[PDB]
Amino acid sequence: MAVTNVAELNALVERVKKAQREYASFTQEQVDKIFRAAALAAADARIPLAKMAVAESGMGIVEDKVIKNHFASEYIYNAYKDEKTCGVLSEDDTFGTITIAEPIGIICGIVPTTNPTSTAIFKSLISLKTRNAIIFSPHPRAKDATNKAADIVLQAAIAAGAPKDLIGWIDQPSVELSNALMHHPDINLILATGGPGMVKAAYSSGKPAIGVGAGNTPVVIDETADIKRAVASVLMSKTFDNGVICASEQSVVVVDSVYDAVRERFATHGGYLLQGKELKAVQDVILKNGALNAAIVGQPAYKIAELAGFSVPENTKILIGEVTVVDESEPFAHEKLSPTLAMYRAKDFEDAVEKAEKLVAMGGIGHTSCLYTDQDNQPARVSYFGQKMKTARILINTPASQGGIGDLYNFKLAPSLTLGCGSWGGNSISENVGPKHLINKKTVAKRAENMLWHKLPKSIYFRRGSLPIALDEVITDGHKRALIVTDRFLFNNGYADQITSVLKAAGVETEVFFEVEADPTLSIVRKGAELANSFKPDVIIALGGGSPMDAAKIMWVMYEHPETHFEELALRFMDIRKRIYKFPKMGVKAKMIAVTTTSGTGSEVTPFAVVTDDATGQKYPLADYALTPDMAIVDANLVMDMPKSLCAFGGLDAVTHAMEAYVSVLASEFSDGQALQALKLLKEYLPASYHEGSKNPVARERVHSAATIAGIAFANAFLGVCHSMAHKLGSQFHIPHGLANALLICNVIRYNANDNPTKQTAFSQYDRPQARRRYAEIADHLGLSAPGDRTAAKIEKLLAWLETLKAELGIPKSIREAGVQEADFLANVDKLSEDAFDDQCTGANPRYPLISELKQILLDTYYGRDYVE
Amino acid sequence: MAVTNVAELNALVERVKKAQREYASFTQEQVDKIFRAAALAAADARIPLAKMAVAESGMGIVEDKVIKNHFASEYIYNAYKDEKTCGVLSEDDTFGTITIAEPIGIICGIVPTTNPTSTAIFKSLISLKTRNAIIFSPHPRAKDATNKAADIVLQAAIAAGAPKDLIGWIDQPSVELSNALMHHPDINLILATGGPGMVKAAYSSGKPAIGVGAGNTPVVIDETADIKRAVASVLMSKTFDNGVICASEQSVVVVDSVYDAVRERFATHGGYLLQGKELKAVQDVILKNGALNAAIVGQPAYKIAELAGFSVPENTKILIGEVTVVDESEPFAHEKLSPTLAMYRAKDFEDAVEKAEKLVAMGGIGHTSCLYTDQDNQPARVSYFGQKMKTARILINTPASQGGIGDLYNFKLAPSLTLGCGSWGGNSISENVGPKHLINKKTVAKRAENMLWHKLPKSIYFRRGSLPIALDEVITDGHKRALIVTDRFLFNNGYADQITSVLKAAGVETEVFFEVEADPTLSIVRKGAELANSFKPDVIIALGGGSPMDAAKIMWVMYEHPETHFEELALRFMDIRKRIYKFPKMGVKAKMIAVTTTSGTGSEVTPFAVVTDDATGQKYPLADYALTPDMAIVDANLVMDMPKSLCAFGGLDAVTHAMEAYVSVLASEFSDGQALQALKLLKEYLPASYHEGSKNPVARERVHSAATIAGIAFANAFLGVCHSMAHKLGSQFHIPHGLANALLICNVIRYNANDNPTKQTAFSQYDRPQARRRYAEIADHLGLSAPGDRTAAKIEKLLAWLETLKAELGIPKSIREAGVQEADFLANVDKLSEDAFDDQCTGANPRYPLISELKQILLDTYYGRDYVE
Numbered sequence A, B: 001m002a003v004t005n006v007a008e009l010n011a012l013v014e015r016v017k018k019a020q021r022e023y024a025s026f027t028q029e030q031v032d033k034i035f036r037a038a039a040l041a042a043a044d045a046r047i048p049l050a051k052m053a054v055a056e057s058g059m060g061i062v063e064d065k066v067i068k069n070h071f072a073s074e075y076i077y078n079a080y081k082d083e084k085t086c087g088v089l090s091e092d093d094t095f096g097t098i099t100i101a102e103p104i105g106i107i108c109g110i111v112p113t114t115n116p117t118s119t120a121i122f123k124s125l126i127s128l129k130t131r132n133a134i135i136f137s138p139h140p141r142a143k144d145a146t147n148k149a150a151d152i153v154l155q156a157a158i159a160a161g162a163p164k165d166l167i168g169w170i171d172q173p174s175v176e177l178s179n180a181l182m183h184h185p186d187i188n189l190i191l192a193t194g195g196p197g198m199v200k201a202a203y204s205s206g207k208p209a210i211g212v213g214a215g216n217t218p219v220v221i222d223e224t225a226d227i228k229r230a231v232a233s234v235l236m237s238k239t240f241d242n243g244v245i246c247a248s249e250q251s252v253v254v255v256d257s258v259y260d261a262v263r264e265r266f267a268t269h270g271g272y273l274l275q276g277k278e279l280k281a282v283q284d285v286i287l288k289n290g291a292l293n294a295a296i297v298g299q300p301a302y303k304i305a306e307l308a309g310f311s312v313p314e315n316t317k318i319l320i321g322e323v324t325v326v327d328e329s330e331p332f333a334h335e336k337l338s339p340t341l342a343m344y345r346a347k348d349f350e351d352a353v354e355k356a357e358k359l360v361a362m363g364g365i366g367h368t369s370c371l372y373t374d375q376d377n378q379p380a381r382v383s384y385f386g387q388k389m390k391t392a393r394i395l396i397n398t399p400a401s402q403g404g405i406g407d408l409y410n411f412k413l414a415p416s417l418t419l420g421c422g423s424w425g426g427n428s429i430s431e432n433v434g435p436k437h438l439i440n441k442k443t444v445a446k447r448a449e450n451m452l453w454h455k456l457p458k459s460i461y462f463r464r465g466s467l468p469i470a471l472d473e474v475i476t477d478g479h480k481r482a483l484i485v486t487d488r489f490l491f492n493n494g495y496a497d498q499i500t501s502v503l504k505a506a507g508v509e510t511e512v513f514f515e516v517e518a519d520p521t522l523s524i525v526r527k528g529a530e531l532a533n534s535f536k537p538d539v540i541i542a543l544g545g546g547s548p549m550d551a552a553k554i555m556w557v558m559y560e561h562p563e564t565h566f567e568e569l570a571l572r573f574m575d576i577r578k579r580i581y582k583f584p585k586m587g588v589k590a591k592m593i594a595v596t597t598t599s600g601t602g603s604e605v606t607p608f609a610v611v612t613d614d615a616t617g618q619k620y621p622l623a624d625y626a627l628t629p630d631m632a633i634v635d636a637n638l639v640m641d642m643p644k645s646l647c648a649f650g651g652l653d654a655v656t657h658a659m660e661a662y663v664s665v666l667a668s669e670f671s672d673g674q675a676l677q678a679l680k681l682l683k684e685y686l687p688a689s690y691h692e693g694s695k696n697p698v699a700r701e702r703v704h705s706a707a708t709i710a711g712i713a714f715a716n717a718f719l720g721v722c723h724s725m726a727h728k729l730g731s732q733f734h735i736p737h738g739l740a741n742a743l744l745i746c747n748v749i750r751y752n753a754n755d756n757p758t759k760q761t762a763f764s765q766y767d768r769p770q771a772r773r774r775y776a777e778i779a780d781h782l783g784l785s786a787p788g789d790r791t792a793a794k795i796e797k798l799l800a801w802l803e804t805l806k807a808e809l810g811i812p813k814s815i816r817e818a819g820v821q822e823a824d825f826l827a828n829v830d831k832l833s834e835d836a837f838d839d840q841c842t843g844a845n846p847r848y849p850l851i852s853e854l855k856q857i858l859l860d861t862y863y864g865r866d867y868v869e
């Protein structure tokens, strides 16, 4: 039963550990009942413990401890009784979160002599609500009391449905014993108290800790304060337990304006101002051996002077010494737990808090500070006192001894002894301790599918003869200044009068910018914003496709936000809503209506805008749904006179826009029927549009509509990896986009079409690799294989249809065959296989390629081979 | 610039410390901008660091680190960018709370080799948002990378409005150096990572810590799971960085129902089942010297077998060994950071989680666990997996490697590396680390006045001839069974037919209980509830006063809640809403209409109900507003035949009911005008009612109304200390209440009437002692002293009026004169001076008496003296 040896300890802990494991399986009602019985047993025993605390400690006063043994039970209960601390605290079912709050284990309670019983009723009683255990290592001066404070708690818990040794205490303490308890393995936490050396040794143990320092507690009394209650509260805080209590106001800092008044008001109401010889004698007994006399602590005032060598009335509550030094040389400013007090003299407020912060900074860093002022009309002072004072508790118009243990003067403050002083003091709690610190929360995280979107430009218009019907719809009914962006071949050949012809004839002012060439550079973009910033357009228009529709919707940026650094605008990301350079909201200065005369790109719908740096020459595909065209237009009358090449490269980038959008990882049921309806039109009408041309406008139109439909697909289901390398392959060699996508898709399919790949994209919605299947759902949709095929022929037949399609469009079989030299390829292939993996298009490819696996399907194309793996 | 010495460290830290102090004074915009620049600089450098991390670490794979260096910047930013962490977080102005969130200081970042760069971009970047600093102590294998990961962060912050050495790193690390950094004083925290030994030495330093262990991560696959994604996600988690990443699924636990299926599905998709000789050879290289081979970590699978002595395809993602042992003897179950994996065989779910909990309990206690099942239709399994598994993260249908660092598969989970494992593991964080852990919150607590009340029984009726008018008002219009409580003198003398006369004549069933005598005991109460529980009344009535009206409203308790233990019902409290035994809501079975024939008590309004234990004989005044009479009645026709004594003792307890209610600490402006209007009527009409009696019914009525008015006062403004001793003085000697209150009030006034008292009640509303003034506002209200008196004569004149009043009512001058013997007083005076301080009435007396100060004004009354102090 008794504990004065190191083995008795190692036995106790075990018969305790085994209580917890039996106590942890308890419910809320089975412990809500243990919590009351232990709190009553502690309240009804408020007087005796307070007697047993003075007989043994030699300090304190009875009637002021009784407020503590009682506060530590009633004011603890009213607060932590309804705190759900057993199981599920919260359950957000929209998400998949649940907080379950298992306990922590067992604890070591390091008790002081200052508050031996309250600090025990407080920990004992709070460690039962969290379904924990605890073991006390008390102070020799108060071992009999704080251990009689737990038996009065335990013997009332076991009587309420608890085990019989859940709690434990050391009877004959030491260092060899505590240091053997704090370092015990079956312990799981340390709940300490007692100032420096204590916390310096709690954390240093090896276990966690909620140790708690302590020290000075400056209090400031400004001109705009109620010097009456400022003083009573100063005395009601020192004399309370004779200041032995922590946080008590060891030092006031008054401003000259009201010093004399305060000086007297302290005198009349039991204040002896240490004027001369008395003072020195008093600041000589305080500090013994660099520390405060361990015999003066908690003792009444008149009992101070006797040790000093003088005498004062027995009714004196306090001993005040008017001083100026605010450093360590003055022992009259350290953490004297006596009723003594230091009275400083300051010019104004700012001069005080500068002085307070200086003497909290010496012994009481982080603990608490106080202020007395107009709590309602001087909120800036407050704001200036909280932002300047490095204390975890700033107590405005409250006494510290009864506001730091806070449920009396202020609510919303966690009632507690064991007041955290923040890392400033050497403890990482920063708050009044409670049961939510003795607790191991834990979070079950159900798989949540990542949110998706089908976002387009409103006002898509599509048929032959749709320009004037559209401009005169939403543009002219509205804006007044336009900026048509296009290329020369369209400005020269009357593709841009057909649009000004309509704006003119109404009130509008046009200005065309036609210095855009294939693969636009950032130099052309600036030059376009440099113009937009002069013409100040109310709207922006973009013709052709790709180069214009990619230079314009970015010129739309530099016009509304010229501070945009392309280096940050083209930063590769991992998710498009968790973007690190969130695009600015740009639809205010001007809109970005878009027209297209080129089939494939589909840029008229999608956020993508491919441009190159003009310094490194790397195409930086940059993406955000803020640069959607805002009323795209797609008229098939601007395509019927296209050459045979641009038709192929276009309609053949659209194929690889849907192919790697039906198979992508962001694919959905919204973007999977459009991709197919595109891929089914590019099969019935694409060859015709190449051979026949304008002679079959029915086909030249569908292809134009399809290539846009893919946009609806790959605007939401981003591209795959064929573009991540086609952008680089089409830059280091100036190969066109569509021609590059054609020389890879018949070797990229068979890359992604492995159900046992080396990697995978880590997308929640992506259960497992479906690409091999997601590619056969294509063939069966086109009509390649009806009868019961292996799912591997449906692919061979998909490729075959491509090699057949790439044949009857003049597409070469390889790059070598496309105007590239093995000497210039092998050299800068490792460079653009890395710069491909670092593209934003590849973050959606189902297989998450390895640099060592793009290089291979990048050589196998130069030599017209097949990636076999 | 460089750091390979212990002094270079002590210099670095200083030029860092001085950055913080300059960085702490920064605003939100001045740091919201530092946070971006550092996150971009880290994202754009996602590839190289991943290269620099493999060249130097020898482990990992490039394309999987890049997801980390990028997650640690983008997914960190999107989450902690809007987190207010600079100043005021919250401001509840109704209360007086403000959370200001000063920073913590500077930090030591202990980095592993597993995640050298991400763990640096994560800490570096999160320590800038909290306006902190940090210093890294990296792993020798990865010193060049994680230090190149901070310069890429710092040099981008200083370029955004920051100092030039805010961050720091060690180039040539050691133990002598870290151990000298962790123990450095100017440090304020430790942000560690690296498993056991690390955290065992972080906390052991002397500073706080958020160190983070690590270990096994069981994953359970039940019958009702999607074995397809269960597997892909198992591989997508191991092969990811080659399992080197923490939290990865080191062990699966499948149930027989689907084991064979899972066994194959693992095989087809890159799973080599270690069947025979291969297995042993494989579980022989894992653990070297009791620990795992530090060369196998992060290495690919096929590179495992080579060390084992066999070979497998290069495309194998994983190495699986079907085993049964679940203890330490099997090294195939420890925290192997390799792509290896253990496959266990279980009968059913419960048999698995019992097995998982056993192998998390060995090396990975607290870190995280996983489960694959129907996340929607099997919520009990979930509930059973979270309540049973001691892990801070339970991952349902998510892969661990990409769900523990959680913003991808589940949201609402704090994205973080540095995953806390809870005290189970040896760290008191219990949660994924973030910036709110690197932060010192602090709470300004403005003085809030404690809420008060003016709560009475509705339906107070008062005039001559008010019984029948009242009973036939709300009782008969309603209830049907009554229980009149009274004493014999009223039952005998027809005071109780006057009330049944009216109930009868209507449909009601009466039963009278008249075994109540003065100073009722708990035996009489039970005997009354023992009756009420038989008659089952719909209403309760109480006549006379005190004894009945105090035994009935408690018999009202035992009737509606017979489980009430008087020991808890009479427990002294510190506040009446923070009560530790909250009374039950008792107005459902029966009401408690009350009548009174005795003036003083005023119990017909107030919650008080004085009764004695009958064992110790101590009057336990118990109080709660739940036992208010619910339609009190006060008719003056039941008093006009009272004797001369009861008139005095009554009207003279009412005096001390208002006197110590206008001066009390809970006094308010609601209860201060009633107290006076009582105290002004007991002065004009009390003497008359004594001498004349029924001959002056005008006076006999007012006194009856006044004595009730005081009830309105001291029901809300509790009594003082005259009752806390009159209850004991009237019990140890059976002196009547009013006679005791009269022999003390003319010595208690001059007790509370000291403006420099020894103590004070600690009530916020009580600025300072006003009693000396609050007693003179009385005299001036009665008419004792009009002309400009000293405020000390107004008291002498108040007392004089009392000694004069106590004279013309036959009240003796002292107790000695009242039938008490010095031999029996001096003996049991120390006993009832303590049992007075332990009364609930004294908790409202302005002076908070000392036991040594009640004894004195308790002897000074025996000898008819004056308390002088």
Ligand SMILES: NC(=O)c1ccc[n+]([C@@H]2O[C@H](COP(=O)([O-])OP(=O)(O)OC[C@H]3O[C@@H](n4cnc5c(N)ncnc54)[C@H](O)[C@@H]3O)[C@@H](O)[C@H]2O)c1
Binding pocket: A110, A111, A112, A113, A114, A115, A137, A138, A139, A140, A173, A174, A175, A178, A179, A193, A194, A195, A196, A197, A198, A201, A212, A213, A214, A215, A245, A246, A247, A335, A417, A418, A419, A420
């Ligand atoms: N912040 C609070 O809530 C609070 C409450 C009470 C007291 N205090 C502070 O406590 C201090 C006074 O308490 P004291 O009078 O107990 O001084 P103290 O705490 O030095 O007394 C020593 C206590 O700490 C233990 N202790 C000391 N050094 C130790 C070590 N190296 N290893 C293990 N245990 C060790 C002893 O066993 C004993 O319990 C004052 O500074 C006061 O402000 C603070």
Ligand SMILES: NC(=O)c1ccc[n+]([C@@H]2O[C@H](COP(=O)([O-])OP(=O)(O)OC[C@H]3O[C@@H](n4cnc5c(N)ncnc54)[C@H](O)[C@@H]3O)[C@@H](O)[C@H]2O)c1
Binding pocket: A487, A488, A489, A490, A518, A519, A520, A544, A545, A546, A547, A548, A550, A597, A598, A600, A601, A602, A603, A604, A606, A607, A608, A609, A610, A611, A638, A639, A641, A642, A643, A646, A649, A650, A723, A736, A737, A738
């Ligand atoms: N997601 C996207 O939005 C996305 C994806 C990939 C590539 N791109 C961009 O698309 C570009 C492709 O360029 P494109 O194929 O869009 O058009 P393009 O701008 O390459 O035009 C190429 C040539 O075709 C000419 N041309 C355009 N329309 C014509 C017409 N109707 N009649 C005759 N000649 C015409 C142009 O004048 C130019 O000389 C790529 O280079 C890249 O910048 C965008």
Ligand SMILES: NC(=O)c1ccc[n+]([C@@H]2O[C@H](COP(=O)([O-])OP(=O)(O)OC[C@H]3O[C@@H](n4cnc5c(N)ncnc54)[C@H](O)[C@@H]3O)[C@@H](O)[C@H]2O)c1
Binding pocket: B110, B111, B112, B113, B114, B115, B137, B138, B139, B140, B173, B174, B175, B178, B179, B193, B194, B195, B196, B197, B198, B201, B212, B213, B214, B215, B245, B246, B247, B335, B417, B418, B419, B420
């Ligand atoms: N939970 C997480 O956030 C997380 C993430 C990744 C890895 N991990 C864990 O980290 C560990 C990785 O292995 P490691 O690379 O940590 O090897 P290791 O465990 O030897 O780490 C040693 C580290 O300890 C540091 N150190 C400083 N003072 C020390 C002292 N007094 N004693 C010992 N070490 C001291 C060294 O500088 C070195 O960096 C594994 O346990 C892994 O699970 C955890």
Ligand SMILES: NC(=O)c1ccc[n+]([C@@H]2O[C@H](COP(=O)([O-])OP(=O)(O)OC[C@H]3O[C@@H](n4cnc5c(N)ncnc54)[C@H](O)[C@@H]3O)[C@@H](O)[C@H]2O)c1
Binding pocket: B487, B489, B517, B518, B519, B520, B544, B545, B546, B547, B548, B550, B597, B598, B600, B601, B602, B603, B604, B606, B607, B608, B609, B610, B638, B639, B641, B642, B643, B646, B723, B727, B736, B737
């Ligand atoms: N809850 C409160 O409001 C409150 C406050 C202070 C004290 N008290 C308690 O009230 C009790 C006092 O009871 P009381 O003194 O009010 O009366 P009492 O209950 O002592 O009994 C008074 C006696 O006087 C006689 N009596 C009563 N009414 C009479 C009448 N109308 N005519 C003739 N004789 C009559 C009866 O014999 C009766 O027993 C004490 O226990 C005291 O502690 C209550």
Ligand SMILES: [Fe+3]
Binding pocket: A601, A653, A654, A656, A657, A723, A737, A741
């Ligand atoms: Fe394309």
Ligand SMILES: [Fe+3]
Binding pocket: B601, B653, B654, B656, B657, B723, B737, B741
């Ligand atoms: Fe009374």
